[PDB]
Each structure stands twice: as C-alpha cells, then as structure tokens.
Inverse folding.
RNA sequence: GCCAGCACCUUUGCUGGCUCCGGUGCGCUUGUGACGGCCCGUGAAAAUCCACAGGAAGGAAUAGUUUUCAUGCCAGGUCGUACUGUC
C-alpha cells in the first residue's frame, strides 16, 4: 500500500509542464531521479508499470536535452534491456514504449530510439561462451559436516528431490517463454521501425537501418 | 589326543601313564581403533527395540502403591534338510 502511494506521488510529481515555479520543476526532477534509482532493483515488484510509464514519458518528450536526467534514464533502460535474457521485462517496457510512440506519431530522438539496440532477447551468442571465472567450494567437506537427525536428513533428501524437479521445470518454462517474448518483441520493434520509415524522419533513418541490420536475421 | 600292558576259536573291552613351559613378525587370513585423502543426495527404506521432554492419574492402619532389583513356573506350530552342484 505504501509503495503504491509513493509511486503514485512520484508519477504525479514527474508531470510538470515546465511553466510553473522553479520549485515545482525541482520537485519533478528529484522525483524522476528517485524513480530512476528505485527501478534498478524494484523492477521485479508490484506496480513497475507506473515507474516504466513515467520514465518513458520523461524520455519520450520532444525536447530532452535540457533535462538533466535523460542521460541517466536512457542508461538505466539500456542496462535493463541488456541484462534481461528471458524477455519479460523487455516486452513489458516495449509495450509501453510502443503505446507512447503511437500517441506522438513516432517522433522521438535518434538517441531515444537507440535503446532498442541493446535488447538481449534479440541477440544470439555462442552455445559455449566463456563466463567470468567464478570459483567456489564444490561441496562441504565430509569431515566438516553438521550433525543432522534422521528426520532432518530425510527432509533434506525430500526437499532436494523437489528442488531438482522445480529447477528442471523452471528451465523448461524459461526456455519456452523466451521464444514467445522474442517473437512479440520482434513484431513490436519491426512495426515501430517501419512506422518511423513511413513517417520518413530525417534524423532517425540511420538508427532504424542499424536496427534492421542487427535484428533482421532474428526474424522468420 | 598320544602311548604302553593284560584278556578272547565269541560285542573282546579292562587297566595304567603323559597330555607341560616358552619365543618370534615389512609374514598370509580376518576383525577392529584413531586418523588422513578423494568422490558425493549429510551416501536405501521399512519392520523392530530403547530412551527423552510433558505432568494425566494413583497410593496406607489385621497385608497402601510400583515391581526396567533378585529368585522361582510353563511353552515354542507349518515348510526345507539324503546326493550332485551359471554365481
């Protein structure tokens, strides 16, 4: 309840027509910074859609160069799209982005449109990529174990056998959902790019063609 | 178990002694104790036995209560079992 009220207040304060007193503009800027900082970890929580909507509305303004936070919000959105592999948060952001663009007749800054270039869901890598060197003790040593009762050991076995099948099912569900999210995001991105091309905005052509070249081979 | 002696056309067995004291191990077989190393779900389940918390209930005037102390009584059915012998 309190987080809902806080996010609603942040959204209300973010909307400032840049014509009121400078105190209100400062309030809106601080609210936008707070929302930008909050979404870095509260993305997997309730009412993330409101934060996404307010941040994208701030970004999708016709003039954002005077805004002292557009750089940071674009960086955060790019990081969110880059680190998201399953495609759930990416699709959630892209739906709102398309909804906002359709209202503005697809008129944004090339830089804004550049966030779609960082979509991890539309990227494919080597099946055997080398991750970072991560080292940990494989198993607790036998002579350094903690005593467990027979009932405790039986419960440990049961919960391990449950967890193994839960992990298998989780992997299967993630694999089957990534493909569908990828298809939906491809549809949305290609629709946005084609609408931009039909509008023929002289300041957005290069980014659009780069997006087509990057994501062209991921489609059907 | 090892001896010695005396009995018989026969189951023809009787008697007398000695069966003691030690040492040794990169030895073989096997059990076991404390460790050390590595793998790994803290490494099958159940019948079965025991204990612990808890404080219900019970206990006295011509045999109070309990009998995880001691002694004493009774019983233990069905099937396999001779012989040989891919693991």
């Amino acid at each position: 309840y309190n987080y809902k009220n806080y996010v609603g207040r942040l959204q209300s304060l973010s909307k400032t027509p840049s014509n009121a007193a400078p105190i209100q503009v400062s309030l809106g800027i601080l609210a936008t910074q707070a929302a930008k900082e909050l979404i870095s970890t509260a993305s997997h929580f309730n009412f993330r859609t409101d934060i996404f909507t307010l941040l994208l509305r701030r970004i999708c303004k016709p003039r954002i160069s005077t805004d002292p936070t557009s750089i940071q919000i674009i960086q955060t959105f790019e990081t969110l799209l880059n680190e998201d592999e399953e495609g759930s948060i990416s699709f959630e952001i892209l739906r709102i982005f398309n909804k906002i663009l359709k209202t503005r007749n697809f008129n944004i800054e090339e830089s804004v449109l550049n966030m779609l270039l960082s979509l991890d869901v539309l990227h494919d890598y080597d099946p055997n990529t080398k991750l970072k060197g991560n080292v940990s003790a494989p198993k607790l040593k036998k002579k350094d174990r903690v005593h467990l009762s027979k009932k405790q050991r039986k419960a440990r076995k049961e919960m391990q056998q449950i967890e193994e099948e839960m992990r298998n099912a989780e992997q299967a569900v993630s694999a089957e959902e990534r493909e569908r999210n990828q298809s939906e995001i491809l549809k949305i991105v290609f629709t946005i790019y084609l609408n931009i091309l039909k509008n023929n905005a002289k300041t957005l052509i290069g980014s659009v063609l780069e997006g087509l070249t990057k994501f062209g081979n991921m489609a059907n």
Remarks:
- The CA atoms of residues 187 and 219 of chain A lie 9 Å apart.
- Chain A is about 60% helix and 0% strand.
- The two ends of chain A are 44 Å apart (CA to CA).
- Helices of chain A lie at 2-14, 22-38, 48-59, 70-83, 88-103, 110-113, 150-199, 205-215.
